[PDB]
Amino acid sequence: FQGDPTQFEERHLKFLQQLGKFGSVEMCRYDPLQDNTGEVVAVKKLQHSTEEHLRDFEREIEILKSLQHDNIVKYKGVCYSAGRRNLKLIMEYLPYGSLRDYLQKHKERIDHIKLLQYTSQICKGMEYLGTKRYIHRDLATRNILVENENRVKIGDFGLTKVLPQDKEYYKVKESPIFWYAPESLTESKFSVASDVWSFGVVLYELFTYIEKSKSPPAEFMRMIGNDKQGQMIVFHLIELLKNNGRLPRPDGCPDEIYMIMTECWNNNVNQRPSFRDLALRVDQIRDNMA
Numbered sequence: 001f002q003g004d005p006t007q008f009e010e011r012h013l014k015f016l017q018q019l020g021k022f023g024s025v026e027m028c029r030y031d032p033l034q035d036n037t038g039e040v041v042a043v044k045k046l047q048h049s050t051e052e053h054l055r056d057f058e059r060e061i062e063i064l065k066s067l068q069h070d071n072i073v074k075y076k077g078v079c080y081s082a083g084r085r086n087l088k089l090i091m092e093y094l095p096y097g098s099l100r101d102y103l104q105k106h107k108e109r110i111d112h113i114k115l116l117q118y119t120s121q122i123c124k125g126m127e128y129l130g131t132k133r134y135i136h137r138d139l140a141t142r143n144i145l146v147e148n149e150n151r152v153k154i155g156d157f158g159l160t161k162v163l164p165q166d167k168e169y170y171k172v173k174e175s176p177i178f179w180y181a182p183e184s185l186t187e188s189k190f191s192v193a194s195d196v197w198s199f200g201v202v203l204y205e206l207f208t209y210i211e212k213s214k215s216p217p218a219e220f221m222r223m224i225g226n227d228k229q230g231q232m233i234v235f236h237l238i239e240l241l242k243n244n245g246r247l248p249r250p251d252g253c254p255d256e257i258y259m260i261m262t263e264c265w266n267n268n269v270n271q272r273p274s275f276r277d278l279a280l281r282v283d284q285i286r287d288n289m290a
């Protein structure tokens, strides 16, 4: 039993709202005291409850339970529903959903200052994750959640891997390709540096405000050619990335931010900056402003 089986009993986990999809997440209220209501929580469940999917779910639960950081979604427990013959993950509920939907829905309260604040908080969450030798493998604005105007948190650790003891990279043997590093596309090798590449893509997303056709997939398809389909796309992408093909500077994006993006988008793995470098640089850019 990963979590205390009495902490969240299914008879008191009341449904409130469906939140969407790597599995499926609901909004619930844990109401132990008759109808006193209580804590609002997010509940993740599986969509195709197979043995392999449930083992991956166990791995994700173990990853999330070991994390305690201001920019990481809080683990709260596990609910063993269906007479303790099923497994559901309990975490905190962030009211404003994904950072992508937040940038699309609430543009009235978002500016460059907020974008740099979110960038820094993501960097610090990733530093914390690297201290655990975890590789998130899926850094994207859709997987970063907004608690309020001033706080974002890294979530969706379904693809997260633990680095081997004597290896600085993890080789996956079983895909958001437009967020992948070239070595991830060509060798299935994932590391902190590939997470830094995906973070560069995340910064691009932030400074595009995710407008029409400005997304990394649409931009990469426009550069590759919308006439192509299938593995050929991937092929072109790899070739495109091998010879310095990059996403363009978003409109209104400062040249220093795009320089950070391009430094993250280095084909040389060891030349990409660390998350500590990136957090320090972003915070100094914020602090040096008037």
Ligand SMILES: Nc1nc(Nc2ccc(S(N)(=O)=O)cc2)nn1C(=O)c1c(F)cccc1F
Binding pocket: 018, 019, 020, 021, 025, 026, 042, 073, 091, 092, 093, 094, 095, 096, 097, 098, 101, 142, 143, 145, 155, 156
């Ligand atoms: N823990 C958590 N809280 C939320 N808040 C949320 C999400 C969506 C909306 S909505 N229907 O677009 O307006 C509103 C509030 N999500 N969340 C998750 O783990 C989560 C995730 F990581 C990815 C996808 C879905 C999730 F649910």
